[PDB]
Amino acid sequence: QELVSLEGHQSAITALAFSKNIVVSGAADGTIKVWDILTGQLLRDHDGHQSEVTALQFKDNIVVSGAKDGTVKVWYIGTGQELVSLEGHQSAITALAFSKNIVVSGAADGTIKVWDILTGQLLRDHDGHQSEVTALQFKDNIVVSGAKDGTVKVWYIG
Amino acid sequence: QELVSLEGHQSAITALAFSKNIVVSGAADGTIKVWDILTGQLLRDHDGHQSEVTALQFKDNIVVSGAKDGTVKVWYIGTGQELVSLEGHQSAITALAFSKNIVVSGAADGTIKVWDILTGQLLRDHDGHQSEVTALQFKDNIVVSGAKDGTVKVWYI
């Protein structure tokens, strides 16, 4: 049944993203791999993160990846090169959402940050839930987030 | 900027889904709540699962929810009533993917199951991975799965 053969990682798969004919996979050792789904070949080994990558988003040749060390990176699928620099969080990334040119990230300390992928500038910043963000949904300038304390919050982004 | 205020759940949020102006939330106690983004009111308390809900998919008025007891449920957003029956998995649901009228579910035993939401029929039933399925991507009849042993597989369906 297997369409192609992928080598996988030397550690647990923690994040997955799929756009056009390219698969991006992240693992608990910080590694990120880019695969061609038409041939099964490994396109490139990304620089990865210094920590387990916890979230991936992949849209229009642009990948956003987050790690347990709080880093959020925005890079070009074709080269793995960083397009822009984000400050990230001082806590592990627990949720990522990517819609239009906006990245929303959630962290274990409850903070939620809104980034512009064009410039990397922090558009919106707050402490959010003050409880680990467990789920993020971002659609049509509306962010819906959930936390470990049971709260569900809705933010308009504009 | 903060649109509405939602009561939330009495336990930790484990899954979120958002379609049109409706939010579906699932919690560690098995409860599933349906919210109206506009008014901010609680639309209904779904029957939920007898286990912690681990995954949520919400698309075209149809919600697919999975739980740690291995149950996958397909129900209508407006009423909460189950439309069809899925026999589910024998271990915990760990990943859900919903594209067109197909649901792909991955479990802690590594099994990957493919369901038709119109009939509830099990379309495909792979052994999948030798470890827990940790990620699923489903697009254009192509399934990409990842597992805790580091494997990544691509399935045509």
Residue numbers in the entry:
A (entry chain A): 2 to 159
B (entry chain B): 2 to 158
The paper states:
Ika8 produced two crystal forms in space group P63, with one or three copies in the asymmetric unit. Ika4, however, crystallized in space group P212121.
WD40 proteins are a subfamily of propeller proteins with no intrinsic enzymatic activity, but their stable, modular architecture and versatile surface have allowed evolution to adapt them to many vital roles. By computationally reverse-engineering the duplication, fusion and diversification events in the evolutionary history of a WD40 protein, a perfectly symmetrical homologue called Tako8 was made. A different computational approach was employed to redesign Tako8 to create Ika8, a fourfold-symmetrical protein in which neighbouring blades carry compensating charges. Tako and Ika are the first successfully designed eight-bladed WD40-repeat proteins for which structures have been confirmed crystallographically.
